[PDB]
Write a protein that binds this DNA or RNA. Structure first.
Ligand SMILES: [Mg+2]
Ligand SMILES: [Mg+2]
Ligand SMILES: [Mg+2]
Ligand SMILES: [Mg+2]
Ligand SMILES: [Mg+2]
Ligand SMILES: [Mg+2]
Ligand SMILES: [Mg+2]
Ligand SMILES: [Mg+2]
Ligand SMILES: [Mg+2]
Ligand SMILES: [Mg+2]
Ligand SMILES: [Mg+2]
Ligand SMILES: [Mg+2]
Ligand SMILES: [Mg+2]
Ligand SMILES: [Mg+2]
Ligand SMILES: [Mg+2]
Ligand SMILES: [Mg+2]
Ligand SMILES: [Mg+2]
Ligand SMILES: [Mg+2]
Ligand SMILES: [Mg+2]
Ligand SMILES: [Mg+2]
Ligand SMILES: [Mg+2]
Ligand SMILES: [Mg+2]
Ligand SMILES: [Mg+2]
Ligand SMILES: [Mg+2]
Ligand SMILES: [Mg+2]
Ligand SMILES: [Mg+2]
Ligand SMILES: [Mg+2]
Ligand SMILES: [Mg+2]
Ligand SMILES: [Mg+2]
Ligand SMILES: [Mg+2]
Ligand SMILES: [Mg+2]
Ligand SMILES: [Mg+2]
Ligand SMILES: [Mg+2]
Ligand SMILES: [Mg+2]
Ligand SMILES: [Mg+2]
Ligand SMILES: [Mg+2]
Lengths: 273, 43, 89
RNA sequence: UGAGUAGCGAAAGACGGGUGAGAAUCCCGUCCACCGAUUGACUAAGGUUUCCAGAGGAAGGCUCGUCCGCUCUGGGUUAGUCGGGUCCUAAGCUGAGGCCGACAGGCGUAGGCGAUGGAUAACAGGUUGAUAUUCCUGUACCACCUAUAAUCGUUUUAAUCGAUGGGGGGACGCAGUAGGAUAGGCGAAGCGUGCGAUUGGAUUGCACGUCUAAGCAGUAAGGCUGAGUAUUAGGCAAAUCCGGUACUCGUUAAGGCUGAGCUGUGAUGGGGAGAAGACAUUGUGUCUUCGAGUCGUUGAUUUCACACUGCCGAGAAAAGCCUCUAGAUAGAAAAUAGGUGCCCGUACCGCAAACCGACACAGGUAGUCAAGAUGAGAAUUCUAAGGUGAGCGAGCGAACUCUCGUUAAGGAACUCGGCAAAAUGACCCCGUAACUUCGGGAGAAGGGGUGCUCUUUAGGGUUAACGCCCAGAAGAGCCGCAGUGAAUAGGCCCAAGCGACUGUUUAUCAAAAACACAGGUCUCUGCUAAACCGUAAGGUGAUGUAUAGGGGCUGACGCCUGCCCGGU
RNA sequence: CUACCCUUGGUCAGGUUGAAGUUCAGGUAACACUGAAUGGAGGACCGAACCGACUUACGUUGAAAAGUGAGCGGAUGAACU
């Protein structure tokens, strides 16, 4: 899974990478591609509103079926492919009527395997079902919050959640974060865990590789000036020098909770992370 | 040493030209001011 | 409108050499096209026009005393006759 | 006033002959010198007439001026095919209705605009003072139109057109070698053309040339690719097209798609080192005829070609194009002949005296081409093609300042400090320590060799061979102070502090131990996420979803990170 | 002009080192493993173009309102344009 580079240079020293053995086709499905120009963290006013985004390799977008709403028709896993837009890999599947779609690639999905969706689908990896029909204790991913909107939860590499119980209109689920919350039982989920489990272990190794990923450098608050940052100024190095560490925009940033009050989901959230 | 002014017909027109001036309320105010003063060149 | 399309003939050394080659040079209305020039020539001089080349000349800076200005811009056509001849004199 | 003072802005000129009122400074000539990965040839921006011819010499020109990018007068830019428009879309801009907002107005859907990218039919020669793929000559190609048409159709059609729809295609990264070609280079007792030395010698001696496009027809190094037939929960309807599926045959083949180049033709034409005739008030000023095109070798940074192989960071769009139907309608056209084909740019400068720098300014300015000797090379030195001698000079050869060379004995005694300088420097061979994260340290260090002649002799590429090219080994000799004989080309070592490292920074006194960094950790955030911009709408986050996103601190890696929650 | 960014293009003589992987041979009960060859990695190495700006001399009513000479760093990349 993980390949460790030899220290031929100080740049490569301690660097690692995925071996991409899971990938079975190295080019994408042409008809499922769309252009994805970079925003570099700049909004519709043309202003930088999120720091540290910019540059990086050009990417095409792969249209991904998060909805899994094509029910009662088998689809055969043509290939597992790399996708630059997300940590998970993606499986190109071919339905029995000849329509082709990308899905998040679950752990253990193999080329030639069959997947299905709907209330009658079997409980096996890659099948999509309403939480109504998914048994208690099952590990799932790509979970909807609103029926028919498409999966929004547990889509990263290695992500999964566990079905815990079934109230009347809602099913209890334990999310990767540890939160236990209710989700409408008409919402769908895909059986299994998202694949590419070694993603998090990669040692990026050098600054340039982050740059290829489109991440620009993070300048620490303490090495700016007072007009730049609450931590700026001071002669020589200085400690934080106030009761709490502060964000660049002057808000406390260590332990201060920011979840807004009076949210609709607060009565659905059973146990915080 | 590279100097500040690097002329470019397209840039000059698109930034300071007649249609750019006309496309904004304040640009139209620029034109009105220059006409009032009696400028030969409005844009 | 042919008499408006054609303004005057051009008489220069280069134009005289062209005339030796059966090419007649005219200053024409700055708004007309090559086709209009051909049709005007055929209407006015009862010739058959083989082809028309055309070109524009920018206003040229010109001085007289302390007054600076420009000459008129010009549109100059060179009409190659297929049949016939034109006597400008 | 300073004062006839500082300065006259990187440089090599000399003389002869002209011209003129006047000449170091203008013109012509000879010789000399300078650049030549260029000071040469193109060209995009930018400038906008500075271009050409004739005339001038007030002012401008750092001197002069008979001259000029100056002044006067008159001229000069030619396109169906080159670049742009009548084609396409990217970022971005704009935006009917719409959403938002005291006003002003902001945002935004459909739709438009918008090259720096996609598509797209012409080449060679000749010609002027000034334009030329634009004019002329020759020979093409593209779209459209008209007439005549071998032939096919004639209303469910079936000849033909065909979507504003479907599908295919266009269509793409980075690196790495290998190969086929071609351009270009080089050689030749192949051929052609000149010349044949007076300074001692030679006369198979010396010098020069040794080509020709698009188009059309054929061919083919290489690259890629199974094909056929049935059927159909999909491609908003349909589909014979695409996708899916099943079967038959096939699979180091055949067929299909691509493809540099080559051959012929184009072309008894053009060009051509040159020769012979002439004409001419003297004529380098022009007319007619004639004039060779070979073989070998080398060989691309061009092309086949993002082809092939490998890789992770996973690499535009839309149209042109092809195809499918839904639809349309009696008519369609292989060929032949004739015809039609607009607008804009086109001059000139363009590593510069014409652009940006107030200057005829030692700066800055994207891209293309770029020969010989040497060499690994686009380095180095000298040359070619081509261009240039720099818009003040003449003397003198003081101090002093600058730039350069050398230096007895000594050799860091200088100095804040070896600052500067000196030394090292190429290629081959021998040889090379602690330490180490096992990669390194390393070109460690420290040594040896290097020219020329001749003899003998293992090879490799290309060829029937000869021949051409590459490339060693051994021995014997010769010369100098010295053989990478010039130029270009690391000084090395032992230790300590700091930062892991490659990077980044105070444009214009600080390049660092500062920033960043990969790694660590804390913390927020369940998605209309948190954070951020905005009054809002609308956005970034993210077409992401806790292996994710924001913020704080720490800063590779190794070993570790103790006690205190009273205060905030 | 300059900072960052967006889309779309361009450029980087020549030489060197030799990661992973693979094949062959050996080796093993089988693997480890060893050697050779192959292979062509890298914010890798030397060095022009190009980018930069460490030292120093010169210049300081400059040739230049930041330059020039000689050395200097990077030069397939977080490159330059
Ligand atoms: Mg950040
Ligand atoms: Mg600071
Ligand atoms: Mg403050
Ligand atoms: Mg402080
Ligand atoms: Mg302190
Ligand atoms: Mg024209
Ligand atoms: Mg005096
Ligand atoms: Mg004095
Ligand atoms: Mg004096
Ligand atoms: Mg003086
Ligand atoms: Mg001078
Ligand atoms: Mg002139
Ligand atoms: Mg004078
Ligand atoms: Mg409106
Ligand atoms: Mg273009
Ligand atoms: Mg010319
Ligand atoms: Mg003699
Ligand atoms: Mg022209
Ligand atoms: Mg020209
Ligand atoms: Mg430059
Ligand atoms: Mg040189
Ligand atoms: Mg001495
Ligand atoms: Mg001595
Ligand atoms: Mg001392
Ligand atoms: Mg002393
Ligand atoms: Mg020194
Ligand atoms: Mg450092
Ligand atoms: Mg500074
Ligand atoms: Mg400095
Ligand atoms: Mg720190
Ligand atoms: Mg502590
Ligand atoms: Mg490097
Ligand atoms: Mg800088
Ligand atoms: Mg320098
Ligand atoms: Mg270095
Ligand atoms: Mg280097």
């Amino acid at each position: 899974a993980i390949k460790k580079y030899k220290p031929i240079t100080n740049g490569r020293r301690n660097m690692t990478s995925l071996d991409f053995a899971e990938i079975t086709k190295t080019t994408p499905e042409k008809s499922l591609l769309k252009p994805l120009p970079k925003k570099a963290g700049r909004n519709n006013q043309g202003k930088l509103t999120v720091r540290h985004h910019g540059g990086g390799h050009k990417r095409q977008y792969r249209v991904i079926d998060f909805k899994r709403n094509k029910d009662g028709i088998n689809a055969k896993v043509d290939s597992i492919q790399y996708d630059p837009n997300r940590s998970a890999n993606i499986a190109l599947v071919v339905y029995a009527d000849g329509e082709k779609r990308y899905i998040i690639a679950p752990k253990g999905l193999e080329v030639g395997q069959i997947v299905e969706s709907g209330a009658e689908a079997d409980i096996k990896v890659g099948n999509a079902l309403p939480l109504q029909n998914i048994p208690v204790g099952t590990v799932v991913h790509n979970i909807e919050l609103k029926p028919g909107k498409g999966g929004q939860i547990a889509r990263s590499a290695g992500a999964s959640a566990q079905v815990l119980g079934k109230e009347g209109k809602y099913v209890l689920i334990r999310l990767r974060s540890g939160e236990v919350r209710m989700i409408l039982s008409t919402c769908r989920a895909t059986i299994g865990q998202v694949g590419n489990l070694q993603h998090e272990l990669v040692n990026v190794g050098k600054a340039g590789r982050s740059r290829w990923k489109g991440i620009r450098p993070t300048v620490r608050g303490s090495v700016m000036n007072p007009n730049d940052h609450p931590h700026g100024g001071g002669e020589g190095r200085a400690p934080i020098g106030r009761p709490s560490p502060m964000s660049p925009w002057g808000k406390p940033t260590l332990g201060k909770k920011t979840r807004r009050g009076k949210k609709s989901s607060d009565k659905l959230i059973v146990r915080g992370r | 040493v590279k100097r500040t002014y690097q002329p470019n017909k397209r840039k000059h027109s698109k930034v300071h030209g007649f249609r750019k001036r006309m496309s904004t309320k304040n640009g139209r105010k620029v034109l009105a001011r220059r006409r009032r003063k009696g400028r030969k060149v409005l844009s | 409108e042919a008499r408006d399309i054609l303004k005057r003939p051009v008489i220069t050394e280069k134009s005289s050499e062209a005339m030796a080659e059966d090419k007649y040079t005219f200053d024409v209305d700055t708004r007309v096209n090559k086709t209009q020039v051909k049709m005007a020539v055929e209407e006015i001089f009862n010739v058959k026009v083989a082809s028309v080349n055309i070109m524009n000349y920018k206003p040229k800076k010109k001085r007289m005393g302390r007054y600076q200005g420009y000459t008129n811009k010009r549109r100059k056509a060179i009409v190659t006759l297929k049949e016939g001849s034109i006597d400008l004199f």
